Amino acid sequence: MAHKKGLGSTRNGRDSQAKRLGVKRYEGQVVRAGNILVRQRGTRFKPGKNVGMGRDFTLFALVDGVVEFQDRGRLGRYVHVRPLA
Amino acid sequence: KFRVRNRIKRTGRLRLSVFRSLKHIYAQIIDDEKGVTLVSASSLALKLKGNKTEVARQVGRALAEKALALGIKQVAFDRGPYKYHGRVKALAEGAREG
Amino acid sequence: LLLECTECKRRNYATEKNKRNTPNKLELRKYCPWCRKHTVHREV
Amino acid sequence: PLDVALKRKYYEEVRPELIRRFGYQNVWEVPRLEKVVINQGLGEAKEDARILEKAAQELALITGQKPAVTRAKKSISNFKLRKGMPIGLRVTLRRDRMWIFLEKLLNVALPRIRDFRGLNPNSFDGRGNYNLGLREQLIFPEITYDMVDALRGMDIAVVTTAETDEEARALLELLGFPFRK
Amino acid sequence: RMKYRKQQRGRLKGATKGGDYVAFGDYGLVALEPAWITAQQIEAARVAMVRHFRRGGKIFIRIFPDKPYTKKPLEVRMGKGKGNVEGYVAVVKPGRVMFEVAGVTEEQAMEALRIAGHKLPIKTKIVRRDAYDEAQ
RNA sequence: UCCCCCGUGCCCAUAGCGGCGUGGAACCACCCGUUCCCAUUCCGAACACGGAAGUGAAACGCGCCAGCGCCGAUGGUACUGGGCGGGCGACCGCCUGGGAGAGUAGGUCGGUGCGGGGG
RNA sequence: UCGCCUCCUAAAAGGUAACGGAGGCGCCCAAAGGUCCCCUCAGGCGGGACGGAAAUCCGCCGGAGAGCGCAAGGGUAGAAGGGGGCCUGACUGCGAGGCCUGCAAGCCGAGCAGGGGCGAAAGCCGGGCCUAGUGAACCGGUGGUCCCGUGUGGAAGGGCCA
RNA sequence: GCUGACUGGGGCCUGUAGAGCACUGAUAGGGCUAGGGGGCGCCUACCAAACCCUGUCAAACUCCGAAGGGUCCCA
RNA sequence: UUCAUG
RNA sequence: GCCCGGAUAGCUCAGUCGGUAGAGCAGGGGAUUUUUAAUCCCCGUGUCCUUGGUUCGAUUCCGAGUCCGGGCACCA
RNA sequence: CGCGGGGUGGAGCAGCCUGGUAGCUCGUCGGGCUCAUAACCCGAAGGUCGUCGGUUCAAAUCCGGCCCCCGCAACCA
Ligand SMILES: [Mg+2]
Ligand SMILES: [Mg+2]
Ligand SMILES: [Mg+2]
Ligand SMILES: [Mg+2]
Ligand SMILES: [Mg+2]
Ligand SMILES: [Mg+2]
Ligand SMILES: [Mg+2]
Ligand SMILES: [Mg+2]
Ligand SMILES: [Mg+2]
Ligand SMILES: [Mg+2]
Ligand SMILES: [Mg+2]
Ligand SMILES: [Mg+2]
Ligand SMILES: [Mg+2]
Ligand SMILES: [Mg+2]
Ligand SMILES: [Mg+2]
Ligand SMILES: [Mg+2]
Ligand SMILES: [Mg+2]
Ligand SMILES: [Mg+2]
Ligand SMILES: [Mg+2]
Ligand SMILES: [Mg+2]
Ligand SMILES: [Mg+2]
Ligand SMILES: [Mg+2]
Ligand SMILES: [Mg+2]
Ligand SMILES: [Mg+2]
Ligand SMILES: [Mg+2]
Ligand SMILES: [Mg+2]
Ligand SMILES: [Mg+2]
Ligand SMILES: [Mg+2]
Ligand SMILES: [Mg+2]
Ligand SMILES: [Mg+2]
Ligand SMILES: [Mg+2]
Ligand SMILES: [Mg+2]
Ligand SMILES: [Mg+2]
Ligand SMILES: [Mg+2]
Ligand SMILES: [Mg+2]
Ligand SMILES: [Mg+2]
Ligand SMILES: [Mg+2]
Ligand SMILES: [Mg+2]
Ligand SMILES: [Mg+2]
Ligand SMILES: [Mg+2]
Ligand SMILES: [Mg+2]
Ligand SMILES: [Mg+2]
Ligand SMILES: [Mg+2]
Ligand SMILES: [Mg+2]
Ligand SMILES: [Mg+2]
Ligand SMILES: [Mg+2]
Ligand SMILES: [Mg+2]
Ligand SMILES: [Mg+2]
Ligand SMILES: [Mg+2]
Ligand SMILES: [Mg+2]
Ligand SMILES: [Mg+2]
Ligand SMILES: [Mg+2]
Ligand SMILES: [Mg+2]
């Protein structure tokens, strides 16, 4: 007979489309001016030398150079592009 | 604490860090990205007795002449506990226009 | 309401968003227009 | 001025008395005096034009220093005021102004609280920091009945440079504070 | 009793923090296979033991059901089930000591913890005493 | 060339906290005053200026201490790329490379640049 | 239920599903924006006149457990928190370069010029701590405009810019 | 026209498996002890917060956190 | 002129 | 989005087509009062929406703005 | 078995507006009336606002969700 003796109102099918966060130019990448480095929501990666912080903390290289990182422990995880010549 | 840190809101180079003591006033041009102090100037261990506004002007004159003694023209003021005031560095010879 | 600042008996709506109950009523903001730089720009 | 009478009594008797009392090893080791704060709680910000900043002028004419209205940090709905703003009066007296206020307090004001068997020497407890309340604010030598509308009991707190409570006890009891024993 | 829970099945994989030693009491039931020990099986084994050695000693239930076992009410598939059919379930991996009896003699302890293992769905060992320790 | 002090950075707690003594010739600070600049929703408390009468008492510097903290190996398990099996199952076993976390032994109250001032 | 945001499932890049788990948005703000200068939180311990056990005040211990308009994370006091002063950069032209993506969108954007804000100056400012707060097109409206104006001058009506 | 999948060497990123309570929560036993229950005047069992030892658990917890994976360079 | 019952 | 009408007391409203401010109900007091109403007499809760303005003086007239009740109209 | 709707004084109900301002009738208690009860008149008083957990400065108000009660559906085979 298949006495379909139920229903059910779900309430939790909802998700925002994900944002492709994170870092995009790792340590040693040869980036250019305006090439964004970190796409983040907080400021997990603090901007160092020659790296601007964006409006939503998008780190991005202000010069033509090769990226290098450092974890300054208590201070933060600075991402700075050291320029080349 | 005086946690003020109008230090690290200076990333432009040639950081003129001051120090307004009770006795003297010291001043020193530090270089950034390679932390080496380039020139410096004390006040009372250079010149005039403790009339501190005028001698803080005169230590700045001596420091800017020391800076043009090796040719540095664009710098950036420092010492977060400043309250830029009677500790004067109203100067010539440094084209920061401070 | 969405209100646009006009250069004073002139052009150049500047198009802000006011919060009308909280203050409005001759919204006055110095603003750079398309022509003749800097003015007073009362709203609407 | 600079020659407050209580300040002179401190600088001429009490500091060598505390030295010859405790066997100090420094002139700055003696408990100095650095703070007399006066707080006025004053949760009165209802309707029908309840201004009540006459008490600020009243406290200013007592002490000699215009107190600041301090906005409430946390907003609690038990007493109906909320959202920061309305009232709490604080004044902080340091040097010679603190000394002339204590000349007005210790000799003229307390001797009078309506019974006044003394102060409460269980009130220091660990820091320097002797705190004491006032039920009736008009014991002071400036303000009698015809300058107010209601009773505006403040509480003062005098802070010493004393590490324990025994040191500030021995300081203030010779500066002129009586106590209960 | 708190933060939102109709939580997932997980998987009863490898057991290392799932199983260290016997700490409280003397003797201990200890599991030999990962299984879901319900609150009903916990209460069932515990009131087997406390009624076996009557008015006896201490029976420490070191596990605790903290996982909402969920059961749909015999229908198709629209969302998670209503939750907590008998209730909550202690996710138990092997080597975990489930019950410990304290002070009561070996003849009651071995014929009590055996009853607890008989009402539990897990093949068990029963440990005596003198396990892992740390003090100098 | 070395310790002493002052700033100023680097590594970011192996350098922190709390102790326990020492420092005052200088330096640095507290201090003595608010006229002077500028000050604090009150208060020269902070900030600032004048001073130098006094003091290291705080603060700070520099030593010892392991109490808390922090770091923490050697191992060895966990876990696992990769392979190959057992297990109706839940899952487990072997080989191959990696290899933690906690823990334990312990290590530890700086190390180091730069410019001044001083015996 | 239909779009958007936050976690998680998502298997330590990204993305990833289900009528899987759990919450939110359809706004707000002329100061909750900019800049300059200050200040530090919650808590707990005590101590204090009405005073709640948390009003206000004082003193210690308090490195983030407070706050950031709002859900949730990320972040954060060496400020993004709170206060004060001055203001309009909630500009106009652009924009190298990227991120992302099927296209369309979305997002960051140093730098140059005009013209200003703030500051002594270095600088910072093209909205808000950030990711939600929305809507392709078409058809109209409204304000300008050196554009077109059906032979010509002009209007109608168009475009363009808002 | 050797760049490719793959691999080796480097350098990073990340927060899963593990694991641990440093946080957000749930927690088991014992000691300590703020507010209600026994007549309640001080008073009486973990009938009950925080601490305290000893125990644990977590996709929406992370002081840590591998295997790996991703990317860039030299091969 | 109102107004129910013991 | 335009077009009307209105802002007069606690409420609903009229306005000599500027020279005086008002009803009606509500509220209160007072008279009778079996009950409550009804009835009777007397007082008000009044910047006449807000300002600007025209006039010698403004509710009145004029414009602006705000709330306020509608009428139609599209609605991409 | 799934929707949506209530829970508010002894009972029956208004409600409560982003949350701060809680009542109505009858019933009740005391009085007055009456020979006495009715009826009527006068004074008040009574409620953890369904429990619970949630954001909130604060919940009865808003968000869930759980227990009773109500109204609906439970169809095509
Ligand atoms: Mg920016
Ligand atoms: Mg500096
Ligand atoms: Mg509109
Ligand atoms: Mg160090
Ligand atoms: Mg010690
Ligand atoms: Mg010593
Ligand atoms: Mg000396
Ligand atoms: Mg110092
Ligand atoms: Mg000392
Ligand atoms: Mg370790
Ligand atoms: Mg290890
Ligand atoms: Mg040490
Ligand atoms: Mg060391
Ligand atoms: Mg990922
Ligand atoms: Mg801000
Ligand atoms: Mg107290
Ligand atoms: Mg008090
Ligand atoms: Mg915070
Ligand atoms: Mg919101
Ligand atoms: Mg964050
Ligand atoms: Mg300001
Ligand atoms: Mg595209
Ligand atoms: Mg775009
Ligand atoms: Mg988006
Ligand atoms: Mg925002
Ligand atoms: Mg079309
Ligand atoms: Mg023609
Ligand atoms: Mg023509
Ligand atoms: Mg344009
Ligand atoms: Mg795990
Ligand atoms: Mg825990
Ligand atoms: Mg957490
Ligand atoms: Mg790695
Ligand atoms: Mg992956
Ligand atoms: Mg090659
Ligand atoms: Mg009748
Ligand atoms: Mg009758
Ligand atoms: Mg009868
Ligand atoms: Mg008879
Ligand atoms: Mg009217
Ligand atoms: Mg009216
Ligand atoms: Mg009319
Ligand atoms: Mg009538
Ligand atoms: Mg009538
Ligand atoms: Mg009248
Ligand atoms: Mg009047
Ligand atoms: Mg008029
Ligand atoms: Mg008029
Ligand atoms: Mg329409
Ligand atoms: Mg009621
Ligand atoms: Mg009822
Ligand atoms: Mg009665
Ligand atoms: Mg049919």
From Swiss-Prot, chain A:
The gene is rpmA. Residues 1-21 are annotated as: Disordered. This is Large ribosomal subunit protein bL27. GO terms for cellular component: cytosolic large ribosomal subunit. Keywords: Ribonucleoprotein, Ribosomal protein. One of its GO terms (biological process) is translation. The keyword Ribosomal protein applies. Belongs to the bacterial ribosomal protein bL27 family. GO terms for molecular function: structural constituent of ribosome. Part of the 50S ribosomal subunit. Signal peptide: none annotated. Found on the solvent side of the large subunit. Pfam families: Ribosomal_L27. PANTHER family: LARGE RIBOSOMAL SUBUNIT PROTEIN BL27M (PTHR15893:SF0), RIBOSOMAL PROTEIN L27 (PTHR15893). HAMAP family: Ribosomal_bL27. It comes from Thermus thermophilus (strain ATCC 27634 / DSM 579 / HB8).
From Swiss-Prot, chain B:
InterPro entries: Ribosomal_uL18_bac-type (IPR004389), Ribosomal_uL18_bac/euk (IPR005484). It holds the Pfam family Ribosomal_L18p. It comes from the Bacteria. One of its GO terms (cellular component) is cytosolic large ribosomal subunit. One of its GO terms (biological process) is translation. One of its GO terms (molecular function) is 5S rRNA binding. Keywords: Ribonucleoprotein, Ribosomal protein, RNA-binding, rRNA-binding. Part of the 50S ribosomal subunit; part of the 5S rRNA/uL5/uL18/bL25 subcomplex. Contacts the 5S and probably the 23S rRNA; has been isolated in a complex with the 5S rRNA and uL25. This is one of the proteins that bind and probably mediate the attachment of the 5S RNA into the large ribosomal subunit, where it forms part of the central protuberance. PANTHER family: 39S RIBOSOMAL PROTEIN L18, MITOCHONDRIAL, LARGE RIBOSOMAL SUBUNIT PROTEIN UL18M. Belongs to the universal ribosomal protein uL18 family. NCBIfam families: L18_bact (TIGR00060). This is Large ribosomal subunit protein uL18. It comes from Thermus thermophilus (strain ATCC 27634 / DSM 579 / HB8). The lineage of its organism: Bacteria, Thermotogati, Deinococcota, Deinococci, Thermales. The gene is rplR.
Curated annotation (Swiss-Prot), chain D:
One of its GO terms (molecular function) is rRNA binding. It comes from Thermus thermophilus (strain ATCC 27634 / DSM 579 / HB8). Signal peptide: none annotated. This is Large ribosomal subunit protein uL5. This is one of the proteins that bind and probably mediate the attachment of the 5S RNA into the large ribosomal subunit, where it forms part of the central protuberance. In the 70S ribosome it contacts protein S13 of the 30S subunit (forming bridge B1b) connecting the head of the 30S subunit to the top of the 50S subunit. The bridge itself contacts the P site tRNA and is implicated in movement during ribosome translocation. One of its GO terms (cellular component) is ribonucleoprotein complex. Keywords: Ribonucleoprotein, Ribosomal protein, RNA-binding, rRNA-binding, tRNA-binding. InterPro entries: Ribosomal_uL5, Ribosomal_uL5_bac-type, Ribosomal_uL5_C, Ribosomal_uL5_CS, Ribosomal_uL5_dom_sf, Ribosomal_uL5_N. It holds the Pfam family Ribosomal_L5. Belongs to the universal ribosomal protein uL5 family. The keyword RNA-binding applies. Part of the 50S ribosomal subunit; part of the 5S rRNA/uL5/uL18/bL25 (TL7) subcomplex; has also been isolated as a complex with 5S rRNA, bL25 (TL7) and DNA binding protein II. Forms a bridge to the 30S subunit in the 70S ribosome, contacting protein uS13; this bridge is straddled by the 5S rRNA. Contacts the P site tRNA. It comes from the Bacteria. The keyword rRNA-binding applies. One of its GO terms (biological process) is translation. Transmembrane segments: none annotated.
Swiss-Prot record, chain E:
Part of the 50S ribosomal subunit. It comes from Thermus thermophilus (strain ATCC 27634 / DSM 579 / HB8). This protein binds directly to 23S rRNA. Interacts with the A site tRNA. It holds the Pfam family Ribosomal_L16. InterPro entries: Ribosomal_uL16, Ribosomal_uL16_bact-type, Ribosomal_uL16_dom, Ribosomal_uL16_sf. GO terms for molecular function: rRNA binding; structural constituent of ribosome; tRNA binding. GO terms for cellular component: cytosolic large ribosomal subunit. Keywords: Ribonucleoprotein, Ribosomal protein, RNA-binding, rRNA-binding, tRNA-binding. Belongs to the universal ribosomal protein uL16 family. This is Large ribosomal subunit protein uL16. NCBIfam families: rplP_bact (TIGR01164). The keyword tRNA-binding applies. One of its GO terms (biological process) is translation. HAMAP family: Ribosomal_uL16.
